[PDB]
């Protein structure tokens, strides 16, 4: 339990390159140098843009131990922490970056089988988080990291993203996460489009009350767009459960081209078991 | 089966830094760039110092598929290959380097619990290789790679190292590997000493026939030096099996200071479950 979150010294890791920033901190690629060792281990380091107090660190630690406790192939685990003036959090470095940026830069080489499997994997991770009774509160294509193209994990859970929140959050339940899951799915199926592009956030809750939802992405059949609309029902309990989302997106993943119309989908593919085994043993030794 | 050894193009990986060389090839740290992807994945690349023919590549591939087929936490798996004029082999990059260099550079911070566990892990991997009916033929502290300080794996098996070979090899059986295991153990317990230092290789088989073995390392009790001597029996079948080596070195690992006398052993230690979990999730996601 307590053994799941390593407390680090400043002197045993170094931030070497910035990777990006959110409205909570800045993310660096970093090197972890174990005491007495001559090696340099690449890590990801989030340093909060908000310097803290020692009593406030008691809040941070109380949640950090929980996020260090997740054990699921499609959920990122918080690994370490260094409680400087500004707190730094450490996790596994994902060289493929987030899924949002990934789809935007590969939108012309992304097939139906990859898209659909990603929706399954993200759902498995949300279903795990629900079984641990952890509400994500910030699910987005930006907070889905790519370990390998075949393997995605969910990050930055358990901590406003108005365009991703349920109407009752603009209340955070697992059913409110289901909403954010639908928005994440829409981001993938639109190859990274910005939801409600150009509409100011202060006015999203208005358009949701009048019945407007995100439009059907061009590559979605009705079976896929039905699911996304169901995630955006005003009644939270009427939304589909994550356990069900797994079942339906797995069904569609065994016949992908039936449920996603993508130009050049017979050229786009999935890696031969030859390429997957080479992927996993180099970067992704997790079971799966 | 065939899906366990990825064939690579030249254009999808690059050698960026040399790491060392043996009398068979040169090892580089390399970057694997997946087709269509914008990331750079660190790998290890062995390029043979011997340019080959296409029919000779049929030999190489026939063995490479076997080495790509090992599934054991303490055995390195061959992952890929690029069959240029000089063949390049690819495997997971171990930033901690080999165990030989590791012990030499940490000899003043290495305790009995680490040394003994390493002997267990190396034995587990040799016991696996015996169960797959693969003779190592070049077991040494140089060919034991450090994934993390707590986790070592055996490399470069299944391909002369006179000072590591059994007398009947100077015949390669699993019992001849047991000999090389004893020599590997002696290398660790001597914090990286060179076996038979200063004695020319052409004259090692002579000294072995007259009964000379490696000396008892200063930190070994008799129980440990008894095992090492048993690995060097002239009768191969009289040597202990790897299955037994596991049992005896595990026994000694539950009471390490009873079997290894190391100055400052109460200061040297093992990482708290806090530090191990941080190690594994960053670098070593294998089960164990
Ligand atoms: C300021 N005033 C006083 C103090 C209060 C406060 C309460 C809690 C935190 C806290 C604690 C723990 C975390 C986070 C935040 C967080 O953002 N965390 C991510 C994560 O670290 N991401 C990464 N990117 C790259 C490298 S590390 C994360 C990673 C992961 F693998 C799984 C879940 C997860 O949440 C972990 C901070 C401040 C707030 C109000
Ligand atoms: C020249 N004339 C004609 C041709 C004949 C020939 C026959 C077989 C090979 C062959 C095939 C396969 C391998 C090896 C050698 C080998 O050296 N291999 C290691 C390995 O690649 N190490 C690494 N270091 C860093 C990056 S890759 C290795 C790695 C591992 F993870 C597990 C086992 C293993 O053996 C694999 C070459 C030539 C010989 C005589
Ligand atoms: N483990 C990781 N490995 C590599 N890059 C990462 C990792 N975690 C986050 N990033 C990237 O670091 C950048 C900053 O992340 P972050 O601070 O979380 O902002 P954000 O995810 O875009 N918005 P938010 O997470 O909702 O605050 C993004 O481009 C992420 O993809
Ligand atoms: N996977 C790996 N990751 C990092 N370094 C490695 C890896 N495999 C080998 N090395 C290192 O690369 C260097 C060259 O290795 P190698 O070519 O095997 O020579 P050697 O092991 O010292 N002698 P030999 O293996 O018996 O031919 C050594 O310093 C090894 O520790
Ligand atoms: Mg993020
Ligand atoms: Mg070697």
Q: Is any atom of ligand 3 closer than 6 Å to the C-beta of A271?
A: no
CA of A15 to the centre of ligand 3 (A): 15
Structure tokens at B262: 């190391």
| Mutation choice for ligand 2 from B20, B24, B89, B90, CB with most ligand atoms inside 8 A | B89
Cα dihedral A287/B3/B4/B10 (nearest 10): -120
**Dihedral (Cα; B150, A66, A142, A207), 10-degree rounding:** 170
- Candidates B152, B156, B157, B160: which one to mutate for ligand 2, based on the most atoms within 8 Å of Cβ? B156
> What residues flank ligand 1, with Cβ below 6 Å?
A 27, 44-46, 50, 52, 56, 59-60, 63-64, 67, 76-78, 89-91, 155-159
d(C-alpha A144, C-alpha A74), whole Å: 9
Instruction: Specify whether the backbone of B198 is left (phi greater than 0), alpha (psi in -120 to 50) or beta.
Output: left
Domains of chain A, residue spans: 6-92, 97-281
Distance CA A176, CA B24 (A): 59
Closest CB to A40 among B95, B106, B149 = B95
Cα distances (angstroms) measured from residue A112 to each of A121, A131, A220? 14, 29, 10
Alpha-carbon gap, residue B243 to B27, rounded angstroms: 32
Q: Is B21 assigned to a binding site?
A: yes
The experimental resolution of this structure, in angstroms, equals 3.2
B211 among the known binding-site residues?
no
Query: What count of other Cβ atoms lies within 10 Å of the Cβ of residue A232?
Result: 18
Identify all chain B residues contacting A109, using CB atoms and an 8 Å cutoff.
36
CB of A17 within 8 Å of any CB in chain B?
no
* From A91, A95, A139, mutation site for ligand 1 pocket: most ligand atoms within 8 A of C-beta: A91
B75 lines ligand 2 (CB under 6 A): no
- Give the best residue of B282, B286, B287 to mutate against chain A (max A CB count within 10 A): B282
Nearest CA distance, B252 vs chain A (angstrom): 25
Annotated catalytic residue, options A71, A108, A138, A275: A138
Phi-psi region of B158 (alpha: psi -120 to 50; beta: other; left: phi over 0): left
Please indicate whether residue A91, judged by its CB atom, sits closer than 6 Å to ligand 3: yes
Asked if A288 and A73 touch (Cβ cutoff 8 Å), the reply is yes
Q: Name the residues around ion ligand 6, CB cutoff 5 A.
A: B 143, 156
- The separation between the first and the last C-alpha atoms of chain B, rounded to the nearest angstrom, is 23
Residue whose token pair is 């309990």: A237
DSSP B114-150: HHHHHHHHHHHHHHHHHHTT---S---GGGEEEEETT
3-state SS of chain A is CHHHCEECCHHHEEEEEEEEEECCEEEEEEEECCCCCCCCEEEEEEEECCCCCHHHHHHHHHHHHHHCCCCCCCECCCCEEEECCCEEEEECCCCCCEHHHHHHHHCCCCCHHHHHHHHHHHHHHHHHHHHCCCCCCCCCHHHEEEEECCEEEECCCCCCCHHHCCCCCCCCCHHHHHHHHHHHHHHHHCCCCCCCCCCCHHHHHHHHHCCCCCCCCCCECHHHHHHHHHCCCCCHHHCCCHHHHHHHHHHHHCCHHHHECCCCCCCCCCCCHHHHHHHHHHHCCCCC
The 10 Å Cβ neighbour count of residue B273 is 12
Indicate which ligand has the atom closest to the C-alpha of B135. 2
| Burial zone of A50 (CB within 10 Å; 0-12 exposed, 13-18 middle, 19+ buried) | exposed
One DSSP character per residue, chain B reads -GGGSEE--GGGEEEEEEEEEETTEEEEEEEE--TT----EEEEEEEESS---HHHHHHHHHHHHHHTT---TTBPPP-EEEESSSEEEEE---TT-BHHHHHHHHTTS--HHHHHHHHHHHHHHHHHHHHTT---S---GGGEEEEETTEEEE-S-----GGGS-TTT----HHHHHHHHHHHHHHHHTTSPPTTTT--GGGHHHHHHTT--PPPPTTB-HHHHHHHHHTT-SSGGGSPPHHHHHHHHHHHHTSHHHHB--TTTTTS----HHHHHHHHHHH-----
A153 alpha-carbon distance from chain centroid: 6
**A:B CB pairs within 8 Å:** 86
Residue matched to tokens 């289901």: A178
Q: Is A23 annotated as ligand-binding?
A: yes
Cα angle A280, A281, A285 (rounded to 5 degrees) comes to: 65
Nearest to A25 by CA among A52, A56, A53, A54: A52
Method of elucidation: X-ray
* CA B142 to ligand 6 centroid distance, Å: 6
Query: Environment class of residue A155 by beta-carbon count within 10 Å: exposed (0-12), middle (13-18) or buried (19+)?
Result: buried
CB contact under 8 A, B41 and A283: yes
Round to whole Å and give the CA distance between A91 and B166.
46
Atom 4 of ligand 2: nearest residue by CA position: B56
- Whether A97-281 and A6-92 are alike in CATH topology: the answer is no
Contact B282 A106 (CB under 8 A): no
**Distance between CA atoms of residues A179 and B240, nearest Å:** 62
CATH superfamily, with its number, for domain B97-281? Transferase(Phosphotransferase) domain 1 (1.10.510.10)
Q: How far apart are CA A177 and CA A196, in angstroms?
A: 18
Burial A244-278 (b: 16+ CB within 10 A, else e): ebbebbeebbeebeebbebeebeebebbeebbbbb
Could you tell me if A273 lies within 8 Å of chain B, comparing CB atoms?
yes
- Contact between B151 and B282 under an 8 Å Cβ cutoff? The reply is no
Would the annotation count A25 as a binding residue?
A: yes
Q: Which chain B residues are within 8 Å of A269, Cβ to Cβ?
A: none
The answer to whether residues B249 and B185 touch, using CB atoms and an 8 Å cutoff, is no
Inter-chain touch A37–B149, beta carbons under 8 Å: yes
Q: In whole angstroms, give the CA distance from residue A191 to residue B180.
A: 56
- As its CATH architecture, domain A6-92 has 2-Layer Sandwich (3.30)
The reply to whether A92 touches chain B by the CB within 8 Å rule is: yes
What is the B93 CA–ligand 3 centroid distance (Å)? 25
Task: Report whether residue B64 contacts ligand 2, using a CB cutoff of 6 Å.
Answer: yes
The residue whose two tokens read 């008894």 is: B226
Cα–Cα distance list, A195 to A164, A279, B64, B123 (Å): 8, 32, 49, 56
In DSSP terms, B15 is beta-bridged to: B30
Distance CA A121, CA A250 (A): 9
Q: What is the dihedral of CA A150, A156, A157, A162, to 10 degrees?
A: -100
Chain A neighbors of B75, CB-CB under 8 A: none
Is the Cβ of B149 closer than 8 Å to some Cβ of chain A?
Answer: yes
Distances (CA, A) of B60 to A10, A200, B89, B213: 47, 62, 10, 36
Burial of B229 (0-12, 13-18, 19+ CB in 10 A): middle
Q: Which residues of B touch A277 (CB under 8 A)?
A: 3-4, 6, 68, 79
Q: What radius of gyration, in Å, describes the C-alpha atoms of chain B?
A: 19
Query: Measuring CA to CA, which residue among B18, B283, B250 is closest to residue B151?
Result: B283
Tokens of B200: 């020319």
CB B144 within 8 A of CB B96: no
CA B276 / ligand 1 centre spacing (Å): 21
Alpha carbons A60 and B75: distance in angstroms, whole number: 39
> With contact defined as beta carbons under 8 Å apart, do B126 and B134 qualify?
no
d(CA A275, CA B80): 9
- How far is the alpha carbon of A272 from chain B, nearest alpha carbon, in Å? 7
Q: Which ligand is nearest to the CA of B154?
A: 2
Ligand nearest to the backbone CA of B24: 4
- Give the per-residue SS3 of B166-191: CCCCCCCCHHHHHHHHHHHHHHHHCC
Q: Measured from the CB, is residue B24 less than 6 Å from ligand 4?
A: yes
Centroid of ligand 4 to alpha carbon of B45 (angstroms): 10
């Amino acid at each position: 339990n307590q053994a799941l979150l390593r407390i680090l010294k400043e002197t045993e890791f170094k931030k070497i390159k910035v990777l990006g920033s959110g409205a909570f901190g800045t993310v660096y690629k970093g090197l972890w140098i174990p005491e007495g060792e001559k090696v340099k281990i690449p890590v990801a380091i989030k340093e909060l843009r908000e310097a803290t107090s020692p009593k406030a660190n008691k809040e941070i630690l109380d949640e950090a131990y929980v996020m260090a406790s997740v054990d699921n192939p499609h959920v990122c685990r918080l690994l370490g922490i260094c409680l400087t003036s500004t707190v730094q959090l450490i996790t596994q470095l994902m060289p493929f970056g987030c899924l949002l940026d990934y789809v935007r830069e590969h939108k012309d080489n992304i097939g139906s089988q990859y898209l659909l499997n990603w929706c399954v994997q993200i759902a498995k991770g949300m279903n795990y988080l629900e079984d641990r009774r952890l509400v994500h509160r910030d699910l987005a294509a930006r907070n889905v990291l790519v370990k390998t193209p075949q393997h995605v994990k969910i990050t930055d859970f358990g901590r406003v993203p108005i365009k991703w929140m349920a109407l009752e959050s603009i209340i955070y339940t697992h059913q409110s996460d289901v909403w954010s899951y639908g928005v994440t799915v829409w981001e993938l199926m639109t190859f990274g489009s910005k939801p409600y592009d150009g509409i100011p956030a202060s006015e999203i809750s208005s358009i949701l009350e009048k019945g407007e939802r995100l439009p059907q992405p061009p590559i979605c059949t009705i079976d896929v767009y039905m699911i996304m609309r169901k995630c955006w029902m005003i009644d939270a309990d009427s939304r589909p459960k994550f356990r069900e989302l797994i079942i339906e997106f797995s069904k569609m993943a065994r016949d992908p081209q039936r449920y996603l119309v993508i130009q050049g989908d017979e050229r786009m593919h999935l890696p031969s078991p030859t390429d997957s085994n080479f992927y996993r043993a180099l970067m992704d030794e997790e079971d799966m």
